Amino acid sequence: FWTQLMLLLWKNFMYRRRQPVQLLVELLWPLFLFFILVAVRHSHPPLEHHECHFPNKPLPSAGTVPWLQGLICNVNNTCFPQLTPGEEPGRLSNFNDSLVSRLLADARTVLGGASAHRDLAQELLALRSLVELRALLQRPRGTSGPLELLSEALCSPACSELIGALDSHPLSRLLWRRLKPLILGKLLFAPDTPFTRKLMAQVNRTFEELTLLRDVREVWEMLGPRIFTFMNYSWQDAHADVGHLVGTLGRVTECLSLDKLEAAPSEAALVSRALQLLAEHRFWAGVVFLGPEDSSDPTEHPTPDLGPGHVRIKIRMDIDVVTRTNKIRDRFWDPGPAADPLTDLRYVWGGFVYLQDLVERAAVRVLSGANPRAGLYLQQMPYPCYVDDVFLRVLSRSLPLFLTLAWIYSVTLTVKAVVREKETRLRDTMRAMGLSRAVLWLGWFLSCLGPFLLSAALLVLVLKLGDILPYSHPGVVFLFLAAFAVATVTQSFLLSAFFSRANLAAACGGLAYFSLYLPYVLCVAWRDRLPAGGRVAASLLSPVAFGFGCESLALLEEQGEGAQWHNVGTRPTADVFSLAQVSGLLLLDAALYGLATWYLEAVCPGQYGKVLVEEAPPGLSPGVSVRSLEKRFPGSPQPALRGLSLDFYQGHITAFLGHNGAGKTTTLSILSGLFPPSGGSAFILGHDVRSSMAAIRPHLGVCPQYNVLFDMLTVDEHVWFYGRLKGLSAAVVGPEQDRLLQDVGLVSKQSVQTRHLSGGMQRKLSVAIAFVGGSQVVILDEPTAGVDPASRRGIWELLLKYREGRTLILSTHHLDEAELLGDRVAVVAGGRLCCCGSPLFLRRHLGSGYYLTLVKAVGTPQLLALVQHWVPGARLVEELPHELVLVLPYTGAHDGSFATLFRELDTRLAELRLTGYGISDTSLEEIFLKVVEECAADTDWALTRQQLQALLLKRFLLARRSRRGLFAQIVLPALFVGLALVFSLIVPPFGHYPALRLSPTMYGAQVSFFSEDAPGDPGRARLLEALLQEAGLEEPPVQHSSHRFSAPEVPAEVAKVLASGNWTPESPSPACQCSRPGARRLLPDCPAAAGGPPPPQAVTGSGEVVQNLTGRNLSDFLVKTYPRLVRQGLKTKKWVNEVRYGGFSLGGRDPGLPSGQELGRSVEELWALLSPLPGGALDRVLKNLTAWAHSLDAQDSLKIWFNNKGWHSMVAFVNRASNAILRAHLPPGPARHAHSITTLNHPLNLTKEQLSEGALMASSVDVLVSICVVFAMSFVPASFTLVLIEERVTRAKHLQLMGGLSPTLYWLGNFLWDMCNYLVPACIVVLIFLAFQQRAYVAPANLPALLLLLLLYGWSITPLMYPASFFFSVPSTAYVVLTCINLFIGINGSMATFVLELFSDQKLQEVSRILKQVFLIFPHFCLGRGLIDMVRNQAMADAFERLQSPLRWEVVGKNLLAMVIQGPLFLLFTLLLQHRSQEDVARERERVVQGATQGDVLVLRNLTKVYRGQRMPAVDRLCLGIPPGECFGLLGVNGAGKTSTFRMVTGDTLASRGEAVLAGHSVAREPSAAHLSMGYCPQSDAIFELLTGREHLELLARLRGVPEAQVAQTAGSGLARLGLSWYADRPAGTYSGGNKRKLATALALVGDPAVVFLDEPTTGMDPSARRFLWNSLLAVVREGRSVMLTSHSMEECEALCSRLAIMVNGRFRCLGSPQHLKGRFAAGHTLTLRVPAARSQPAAAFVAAEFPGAELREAHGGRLRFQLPPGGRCALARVFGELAVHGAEHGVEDFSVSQTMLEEVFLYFSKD
């Protein structure tokens, strides 16, 4: 058991040792992909980012100075790792050290002190703020722009000049980019009803209040000169500085739109005016005050409540500035704060929130009827520290793909090797020698699995070294890769168990290896949709399981601890498989694959997809015995093998004799261990083979018919393997090897150590191998099945050298080989034992005896009396004239009695007029036919015009016969797209911008804040209560108090930690969380169970959670608690639903001075004094100053926290806050439900310049239809090339070439035909498009472009694939391959270009236009993308002007021109490819050389052919002279060179040396003239299957030139000459064997060629048809036309052909007429002697002495034949008595004489 496994492993390794290239490829190819992956990883390393806090952004409702401070200071949005002052619950303003704030505070306290007084100089002098202001005023420029000075202070042609000055600094250029649209904008409102007029007046009041500096200016200019004239460092500097500041402020006010507010009557006019302003770049925003009572709201409810009181608003702006409003959350989650002002924070610089706040404030002021106050601020939540790395998701989604791409190659090699050893049956013989399937399959396991576990280790090493998977231990990953390798090996064997062909299985198994990877890709995208349980079901496929384990590997890799011994059995997340449980599924799937193979091998088993007896030897010992053995196949009800009672004896070479199909191979195989005997017994050597099992194998050796040799194994290795397996010991295998080696004499050939280098001789080695075990019994099967006659001598000699002591049973089909070797013969026919006996005993048991024929140049009774005188018995069977056959009596035949007859005949020969007597022995050929037949009975330009017409006719008749094939290949693709048009009538979603109802409820269930700070005010209570009302909570405020505690319990384990620390809520309460430790990386931050430890009170309303976080550290709480909400949804990482989005905090501390009443009192006192103006401008200014002083208090404020990862979070909560304020200021009752505000978002239409880019988004569904059109139209040309491939595979194409047809005209006819075929689908497609009214297609300008595209695409694509006919030798496979190639090129190119154009965010990828201009050199890409450009061009024109043409040569014109250029060159290429190629014997040999005979039709002259690599000519130095009026004959054994001679003479194959002339026409000089008068009929039956034979005949006649009227009669005569009457109307495909041959012969005969060539005309043909062939050829030769014919039927040549030539090794031997040959050498008699002594000297000595001629013919130990001088003058009677005496003189049992037999001519054939 172990030795068999060792031998199998040694063989499997010996295969691989020989090839040093496939091993290198399989070792290096998998590593290249991972080196590429290592390079990619080295390209993009991860980046680490720390914590950062964001500053505060104030809204205009809070104020104007802080709002400007936020506009300029907070542009950069720089992170601050430390806490910012704005986040503290008390502080609401960040800038405390700002110069402006210091100036304001100092001024307020100075006026307060002055009002208290009425010392002032002392208070004012000690002020740093005044000194700083003076220094800032005294600045000699030094700044790029005034914005720099403004920043330093805080933290019209003149206007254009100021902008140009600002252009100097790019950083300030961004500031002006943010400022210019709002400064110079044109606000608009489509409704102009008086209510909207009131609203816009309220809004305009803000800008009117902003326009109050000019009044202070003019009071300055009218009070300046008064003081200047009154009084005339302090004075001179002060006056100049005040004047300069006033002038600068006035210059700033010069660039003011002032009345930016404008109105429009309608929405359409609104859009038009906005577009015009955008063209002028003067547009900022547009507003629409749509009324709910109008109810004209697209895709939204008309109104929530009936009647007025509800305000619905739409703010439309430029698309480039407002965020796209199609989707809510990003499609790929990112590990970042999502806070970059340029890319994601668009509303801050866009201005949407500013205008929303202004409009909401105006609306609440109008509706409520009161004056609310609420300073709104915007604050960004802080974010933990993280690491940005895109590479880990790349591994999560891409690692399985690279592994499968690396391991496809080994699966291909394994499947090809298994199917190779399966197809050639080299494995099937190993079962007979004893080896069982288990050993072979275990050898396959342990041998194929080798390279997999040598590549897995290298991959693991590369993974660890290349930093792709660091911080992990290689053992755990190896224990997974090895499981995958086992699973894929079993899968490869399962695939190998499907097919029975080598190349097909090798190419197809690699397809099913990849096709099972698709479900993983299809299910990873639908991660949430699939249930948990179905994942295990989908994990049955091995790559799916590998991917599902690889996601867990990557997920554990993120957390800093890769696959390691600590966490092998731990699930990283609730619904991801642990790395351990994946291996179990992989091994279970491998076992399932093994069981599937085990079952599948059982579906088709077994199939390799008269009582006259003599039993009496001198020693009776039945070493082998078969008794009543019978076997029945289920397919045939009659048994395959019937009763076989034949016995065997040791030492006798018993031979089976029977025709093919008699059950000989089955009977031989039953005795061996390959099939079960159905019944009876098969006792061998005394113990049955089934029972004896391996005990009988060492004494039995079997060699079957098919050759059993392993190609790569050397000469000696075969004997080594085949001796070791039988159980032979190690020391003597050397000797048995040497014995068989010299017995065949291959010692020197053992040095080269090759097995596939030597050919033909291998059968000798295969026969010898059967004797390696010294077996007592040997069962050979056809030892001479397919070897040449030159080598059968060695097989005969060895099989007779091993004849003594070893029973040998062989099976031969030839009748000759049943007498030379067989000691007994058993006749089998139809699976039954017809006859048995011995060769000598069989011959004697006939009714007739010994034949003596008497020819005539007197009277039978005189001869009868003379014969009766010498021998009494005389049977007279034949008495016809000219021959007198006498039957000598075998019963009582005597050597002397027959002798005396010839003695008297010679003396009386003259007067008897016999002139020769013929003695004939009873031949064994006819008795075999006699008994079997008896046994069977017992059981029972003018030429061109006719030339083009025929080619079209042949193709036309092809379509008529096959209409189902034409319909599917042509009509079905056209109807494929047609049904799609109706099914694709759904609305196309492409990216259009709908209107989104911006509200907080759209996001969904969430957690919200209602923290309160400084609640000591009755007014704040109303707002706090109102905030809860909108959230859906219980209306009464005391409900929370009624609920009392509404919080979860504190965890017990955290209580000890809290007690350990101080846990003051304000100061840092909890402990720090985990972070990046330097050597490790973490994506999130993992805290303890104590982050803001006590669960804050939570109340649930209507799908919402509200949390009371008052007096608690908010920043630390948010930072600590953030990752816990996210980690629930990090499993899929596609659409992450955060839980907290936004929250409110009611600030109560005011930044400015709380007491502004004293400032107002001081202002009023100043107004009363100082002579107030009667006009009242100064009084107006001071009244507004007092109003500002009252507004300085800012009694209540509010702050809003928002999460930036939610795009529309800001606006929704601003809307919620404004609605809450409106509810709060409205008194309680039903009025609260009546009043509400709704806000929306809808971007404007695309501008023309923006249309030029957005048209790309407009393509939409067009891509889907274009792909279907390309797919449908990519079918037909493969069907076009199908028929051409079929014609080229058969020789019928060469028949057409040999005819009058020229290949170029044939190609042209094919081109016209298949264009005529292709034209119909184009029209069908056009009418289908026109029927359903596609706007892009039905346009009068577009239609000609589409028609030209379709017609030209058909016209040029066809010549691409005609050259592919030569490459592919099979029709069906080429069809699929070329269709897939067309689909590949077209779809891939079109999709790649279309995607590249869409996503041209970076202009570097836009340069692909030159790549497309390269792609115009390819013809199939032109059709695909060309249709895409057609639809868009009309789409733009439908909106560019209504709200140029495809015929012009830029959209599809380039494609058309280039592809028409491509058209003819491929036809030229294939046409060039078609023409790419550029003593009797001695007397006749000299005659041709000396002179040429004009009568000779065919004259060969020194013809020679040399195949490459053979080094010996197939035909060498061949020359012949053939007279015209006779019929020739050529003879030779298979392999002599007949077919090569016919091909060079005919012209199919090039001639290496020499030329032939036909009818005075040289082949090289003018082949076409020679082609006219020749008719060729090879062995191959070159006909068109689909057409009927008659159509073939009319077609060839039309090529021949028969007049059209007589064509039918010519066809009738041509068919009637060779039957075919019943098969005339039947297609050539459905013909029997002989019918095709006779049809081909008739086709060669039709047209009456001058010379007709026939290669093997008769091969298994009925005698009647061959007789018709005789008659036809006799008539032809009567007419005077030469017929060259070659066949192996020797009786045919003698009867008809005038001359016969026999050829060996390409050289003639006789070259004479049959009658000359029959007399020159084939005359005389040959004595046949049987000698058991095996001594040549005793037999040769007496024959040579008695007869002068001592030539030896057919010398063998079994039987010896002799040659003696022919035509002996002495009587033949001399030998008979001489034989009688010399049988005693020298050892000879019996003899026979061969004198002028019918077989004498046959014996002549064999020897020469």
Ligand X SMILES: Nc1ncnc2c1ncn2[C@@H]1O[C@H](COP(=O)(O)OP(=O)(O)OP(O)(O)=S)[C@@H](O)[C@H]1O
Ligand Y SMILES: *[C@@H]1O[C@H](CO)[C@@H](O[C@@H]2O[C@H](CO)[C@@H](O[C@@H]3O[C@H](CO)[C@@H](O)[C@H](O[C@@H]4O[C@H](CO)[C@@H](O)[C@H](O)[C@@H]4O)[C@@H]3O)[C@H](O)[C@H]2NC(C)=O)[C@H](O)[C@H]1NC(C)=O
Ligand Z SMILES: *[C@@H]1O[C@H](CO)[C@@H](O)[C@H](O)[C@H]1NC(C)=O
Ligand U SMILES: *[C@@H]1O[C@H](CO)[C@@H](O[C@@H]2O[C@H](CO)[C@@H](O[C@@H]3O[C@H](CO)[C@@H](O)[C@H](O)[C@@H]3O)[C@H](O)[C@H]2NC(C)=O)[C@H](O)[C@H]1NC(C)=O
- How many residues sit close enough to ligand U to count as binding (CB under 6 A)? 8
Q: Which residues pair with 1792 in a beta bridge?
A: 1728
665 is a contact residue toward ligand X (CB under 6 A)? yes
Shortest-Cβ-distance residue relative to ligand Z? 1187
Partner whose footprint covers residue 1040, from ligand U, ligand X, ligand Y, none (CB < 5 to 8 Å by kind): ligand U
Q: Is 1537 annotated as a binding residue?
A: yes
The Cα 1540–Cα 1549 span in angstroms is: 8
Helix (H) and strand (E) counts in the chain = 71, 38
Burial class (CB in 10 A: 0-12, 13-18, 19+), 91: middle
Task: Identify the DSSP state of 325.
Answer: -
The Cα 774–Cα 684 span in angstroms is: 16
Residues 6+ apart with CB under 8 A from 1538: 1530, 1532, 1655, 1686, 1703
The Cα 1697–Cα 1745 span in angstroms is: 42
The Cα 692–Cα 683 span in angstroms is: 10
1291 is a contact residue toward ligand X (CB under 6 A)? no
Chosen residue from 83, 612, 1257, 1395 binding ligand Y by CB under 6 A: 83
Task: Identify the DSSP state of 1299.
Answer: T
1116 is a contact residue toward ligand Y (CB under 6 A)? yes
CB-based burial, 50-79: b 16+ in 10 Å, e otherwise: ebbbbbbbbbbbbbeebeebbbbbbbebeb
Dihedral angle computed from the Cα positions of residues 566, 570, 576 and 581, in that order, rounded to the nearest 10 degrees? 90
Chosen residue from 5, 11, 67, 88 binding ligand Y by CB under 6 A: 88
Q: Is 664 annotated as a binding residue?
A: yes
The Cα 246–Cα 241 span in angstroms is: 8
Contact assessment for residue 339 and residue 1204, using Cβ atoms and an 8 Å cutoff: yes
1035 is a contact residue toward ligand Z (CB under 6 A)? no
1443 is a contact residue toward ligand U (CB under 6 A)? yes
Q: Is 263 annotated as a binding residue?
A: no
Q: Which residue lies nearer to ligand Y by CB, 253 or 1115?
A: 1115
1068 is a contact residue toward ligand Y (CB under 6 A)? yes
Q: Which residue lies nearer to ligand Z by CB, 354 or 1584?
A: 354
Q: How far is the CB of 635 from ligand X (least distance, A)?
A: 5
Contact assessment for residue 1246 and residue 1254, using Cβ atoms and an 8 Å cutoff: yes
| Degrees to nearest 5, angle at CA 1727 with 1722 and 1728 | 115
Which residues in the 250-289 window bind ligand U by CB under 6 A? 271
The site string for ligand Z over 1172-1201 (x = CB under 6 A, - otherwise) reads -----------xx--x--------------
Partner whose footprint covers residue 693, from ligand Y, ligand Z, ligand U, none (CB < 5 to 8 Å by kind): none
Q: How far is the CB of 1443 from ligand U (least distance, A)?
A: 5
Extract the tokens encoding 1739: 């037999």
The count of other CB atoms within 10 Å of the CB of residue 1568 is 9
Chosen residue from 48, 167, 254, 259 binding ligand Z by CB under 6 A: 259
Q: How far is the CB of 782 from ligand X (least distance, A)?
A: 8
Partner whose footprint covers residue 1302, from ligand Y, ligand X, ligand U, none (CB < 5 to 8 Å by kind): none
Q: Which residue lies nearer to ligand X by CB, 671 or 1428?
A: 671
User: What order do you get walking across the sheet with 1515-1521 strand by strand?
Assistant: 1515-1521, 1498-1505, 1553-1558, 1561-1562
The site string for ligand X over 589-608 (x = CB under 6 A, - otherwise) reads ------------------xx
Partner whose footprint covers residue 83, from ligand Z, ligand X, ligand Y, none (CB < 5 to 8 Å by kind): ligand Y
Q: If phi over 0 gives left and psi between -120 and 50 gives alpha, with beta otherwise, what is residue 77?
A: left
Q: How far is the CB of 1039 from ligand U (least distance, A)?
A: 8
706 is a contact residue toward ligand X (CB under 6 A)? no
Which residues in the 1187-1226 window bind ligand Y by CB under 6 A? none
Amino acid at residue number 1729: L
Q: Is 1534 annotated as a binding residue?
A: yes
695 is a contact residue toward ligand Z (CB under 6 A)? no
Q: Which residue lies nearer to ligand X by CB, 1536 or 1773?
A: 1536
96 is a contact residue toward ligand Z (CB under 6 A)? yes
Q: Which residue lies nearer to ligand X by CB, 664 or 1223?
A: 664
Partner whose footprint covers residue 1067, from ligand X, ligand Z, ligand Y, none (CB < 5 to 8 Å by kind): ligand Y
Partner whose footprint covers residue 310, from ligand X, ligand Z, ligand U, none (CB < 5 to 8 Å by kind): none
Task: Identify the DSSP state of 1508.
Answer: T
Q: Which residue lies nearer to ligand U by CB, 1016 or 1078?
A: 1016
Q: Is 70 annotated as a binding residue?
A: no
Q: What is the number of alpha carbons within 13 Å of residue 1453 lying toward its C-beta?
A: 8
The Cα 594–Cα 489 span in angstroms is: 10
- DSSP state letters, 1345-1413: HHHHHHHHHHHHHHHHHSTHHHH-S-HHHHHHHHHHHHHHHHHHHHHHHHHHHHT-SSGGGGGGHHHHH
Q: Is 1635 annotated as a binding residue?
A: no
Q: Which stretch binds ligand Y (CB under 6 A): 1061-1069, 1189-1197, 1470-1478, 1491-1499?
A: 1061-1069
Chosen residue from 232, 299, 660, 1041 binding ligand U by CB under 6 A: 1041
Q: How far is the CB of 319 from ligand U (least distance, A)?
A: 12
Residues 6+ apart with CB under 8 A from 564: 472, 473, 476
Which residues in the 1236-1255 window bind ligand U by CB under 6 A? 1245
660 is a contact residue toward ligand X (CB under 6 A)? yes
Q: How far is the CB of 95 from ligand Z (least distance, A)?
A: 9
Q: Which residues pair with 836 in a beta bridge?
A: 826
Q: Is 1300 annotated as a binding residue?
A: no
CA distances from 1070 to 243, 682, 1054, 1073, 1376 (A): 59, 93, 10, 9, 69
Chosen residue from 341, 677, 1129, 1535 binding ligand X by CB under 6 A: 1535
Contact assessment for residue 1159 and residue 200, using Cβ atoms and an 8 Å cutoff: no
Which residues in the 1076-1115 window bind ligand Y by CB under 6 A? 1113, 1115
Q: Which residue lies nearer to ligand Z by CB, 69 or 492?
A: 69
Q: Is 1538 annotated as a binding residue?
A: yes
Q: Is 1101 annotated as a binding residue?
A: no
The radius of gyration of the chain's CA atoms, rounded to the nearest angstrom, is: 54
- How many residues sit close enough to ligand Y to count as binding (CB under 6 A)? 9
Q: Which residue lies nearer to ligand Y by CB, 384 or 1537?
A: 384
Q: Is 659 annotated as a binding residue?
A: yes
**Helix crossing, 860-870 with 895-907: angle to 10°?**
140
Shortest-Cβ-distance residue relative to ligand U? 1040
CA distances from 669 to 643, 663, 676, 677 (A): 16, 10, 10, 10
- Which candidate, 1329, 1307, 1317, places its Cα nearest to that of 1276? 1317
Contact assessment for residue 488 and residue 407, using Cβ atoms and an 8 Å cutoff: yes
643 is a contact residue toward ligand X (CB under 6 A)? no
The Cα 1570–Cα 947 span in angstroms is: 18
Which residues in the 965-994 window bind ligand U by CB under 6 A? none
1067 is a contact residue toward ligand Y (CB under 6 A)? yes
1734 is a contact residue toward ligand U (CB under 6 A)? no
Q: For binding to ligand X (CB under 6 A), which residues are involved? A: 607-608, 633, 635-636, 640, 660-666, 1507, 1510, 1514, 1534-1540, 1579
Per the annotation, binding residues for ATP are 658-665, 1532-1539
Q: For binding to ligand U (CB under 6 A), which residues are involved? A: 271, 298, 1040-1041, 1108, 1110, 1245, 1443
Q: For binding to ligand Z (CB under 6 A), which residues are involved? A: 91, 93, 96, 101, 105, 200-201, 204, 207-208, 211, 258-259, 261, 1151, 1183-1184, 1187
Q: For binding to ligand Y (CB under 6 A), which residues are involved? A: 82-83, 88, 1066-1068, 1113, 1115-1116
Per the annotation, binding residues are 658-665, 1532-1539
